[PDB]
Ligand binder design. Structure first.
Ligand SMILES: Nc1ncnc2c1ncn2[C@@H]1O[C@H](CNCC[C@H](N)C(=O)O)[C@@H](O)[C@H]1O
Ligand SMILES: Nc1ncnc2c1ncn2[C@@H]1O[C@H](CNCC[C@H](N)C(=O)O)[C@@H](O)[C@H]1O
Ligand SMILES: Nc1ncnc2c1ncn2[C@@H]1O[C@H](CNCC[C@H](N)C(=O)O)[C@@H](O)[C@H]1O
Lengths: 244, 243, 244
């Protein structure tokens, strides 16, 4: 199994087998919530449409796509041992929040993801990255994963937009895989969670298959009441499939 | 222990013996929060006054009491295997939400109780029943529990009314058992929890006994201060107001 | 190890060896959040400034220091078997709340600390002490600990004031140890951070400070300028040392 180069919530890990079992075939996969990219990275579609609300994430991605070699070399230089400390971390973090250059921001963003508290991505009320120092023994530099992601990215477009807009791009030959922020056990709201079920119902009426993952709860069975449902033991996980 | 025909909050047994241990005796039992009816169905009071704010529940109970065979027969039809899919659950849920007929609604309510998600009874801001499909392999039709509930109901009256009105019906020959929505670890509010203790205090001074059960917490010991308390093992509390 | 005579939130028992490992040396110890007094009671500074916002506590501690024998003798009489019941508990609680005599308040207050639900100190919106009856088997009368506190108080001043005023009393010869109310796993987040800002001001002036708290995203954010030490023990706890 191929790994994501970023530590990122639900690098959707234990469930790849189950998603691939239910994920229907087509020319194109659309992911309105790409995140880590683990589905993207472990499937063989002829092309991908990958979107996310997080503008840093998408920008990093476009940069790993178009400037591969220059990116990897520049970023390797921050995985040295002179950087594993707080004086350097809060330093790189102040630089990231004051920079207006995409390439350098993207270099700093990968250091923060791998040297920062629990590999989190968070912002204060002014929009500044505000994850504190994560005190790790030795952060892995993800060289192999960066290369594999780049190569694989040659068949992808990356958009920074809302799930409504990326799902409007899916067509005849598309499949849609949705992995939204999890339902309760600028946040993602219950209105949006149900909105996402509606868009899916509309895409299957046009014969575009949609698959959504989420926790198994009263609200998730309510919103996905029209999909074929599949509960998966490992808080249980719910897979909802809208087949034409 | 005789079982309740409804799934209804908290698989309600884990207590019965301790309750009967402390629950004093008399002619008539008053339950302001009947819910599933476990106490009623496991005691031998000569008479019962049984009350709940939930009007779908009370209206069901009256019908099981007065139209037993007619009910059981209408309800058994909904337990055939043709009804055990998502398509039929949502159609019946919609039929119940749109119906103005107490008998048909009582029939659907048992279906929704036994085929819906975890046995819940919940409503949205529109007042509509909103529990989704439970996906159970083979739900049980509670025919024996139904008939037993009805033999016993022959000595009960059922009321749809808040705890203060039902407690006002107690007299010298009664006992009161109270099973409020639990204290914390359109909700039932802390002001209402306190108010129930105050009603118990005024009943016991009229020589009418009261037993209340709840979790054991700072607020529950506060509310129930003037009763004798027994803890049982999260921890449960029993508060007995003995004349 | 010497024990506090009150049951009190964070009667810091397991942390003590750790706090002493990292706590520097000087003439005076300043505690802005003394509470139950464990660090006071298990160190040897030649002098102490002990502070807390809770005035019943401070008044108590002043009674114990300055009226030692009159206090033990009158407190002891409440620790009998006649008094271990709800009628008596509620009678005493109401007396405490209606009383204007510091002395008798400080006597009632220990009784309530030892007979009361989980040794809690709480007040309602009226400012009346509202902890209910705790139904204990036989509550212990902390005789030795009272004498030990009093002897030890001869080298101590107690003030009832907020952390910013006590901290300001520290000089060249002082060391400050802060034990604030716990970060989320009232005292506000703004106050949590303010504390850490004052610590930074003391260290620039050559005055050491140690802080203790839960290990969390936020505590690492606030104490980002300290040598940090994680102690295992139910979340980890953080110790934050501002050294010159
Ligand atoms: N409104 C949104 N539209 C598109 N993408 C969104 C939106 N809100 C959040 N996101 C992204 O959606 C992705 C969701 N990660 C979900 C992972 C897992 N199910 C979880 O909740 O931990 C993240 O990358 C977010 O940045
Ligand atoms: N205000 C109320 N008056 C009368 N009955 C009420 C009121 N509020 C809720 N109830 C009913 O009280 C019953 C609550 N008993 C369940 C309590 C159980 N200890 C629990 O919380 O799980 C429910 O059936 C409610 O419908
Ligand atoms: N604003 C305050 N200034 C000084 N002391 C305060 C302030 N707010 C609360 N306190 C006191 O500081 C003490 C804190 N207890 C901490 C023990 C442990 N870490 C805990 O949170 O349970 C208590 O005695 C409070 O009364």
């Amino acid at each position: 199994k191929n790994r994501a180069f970023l530590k990122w919530a639900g690098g959707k890990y234990p469930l790849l087998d189950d998603i691939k079992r239910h994920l229907p075939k087509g020319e194109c996969l659309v992911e309105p919530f790409v995140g880590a990219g683990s589905v993207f990275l472990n499937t063989d579609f002829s092309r991908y449409i990958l979107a996310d609300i997080n503008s840093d994430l998408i920008s990093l991605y476009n940069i790993v796509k178009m400037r591969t070699d220059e990116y990897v070399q520049a970023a390797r230089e921050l995985f040295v041992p002179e950087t594993n400390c707080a004086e350097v971390y809060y330093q790189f973090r102040e630089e990231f929040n004051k920079s207006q250059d995409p390439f350098r921001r993207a270099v700093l963003f990968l250091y923060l993801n791998r040297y920062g508290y629990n590999g989190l991505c968070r912002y204060n009320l002014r929009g500044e990255f505000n994850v504190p120092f994560g005190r790790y023994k030795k952060p892995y530099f993800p060289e192999a994963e960066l290369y594999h992601f780049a190569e694989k990215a040659q068949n992808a477009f990356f958009y920074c937009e809302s799930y409504a807009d990326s799902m409007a791009r899916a067509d005849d030959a598309s499949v849609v895989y949705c992995d939204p922020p999890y339902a309760p056990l600028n946040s993602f709201t219950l209105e949006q969670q149900a909105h996402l079920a509606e868009i899916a119902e509309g895409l299957v009426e046009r014969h575009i298959p949609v698959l959504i993952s989420n926790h198994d709860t009263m609200l998730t069975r309510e919103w996905y009441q029209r999909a074929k449902l599949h509960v998966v033991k490992v808080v249980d996980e719910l897979l909802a499939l809208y087949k034409p």
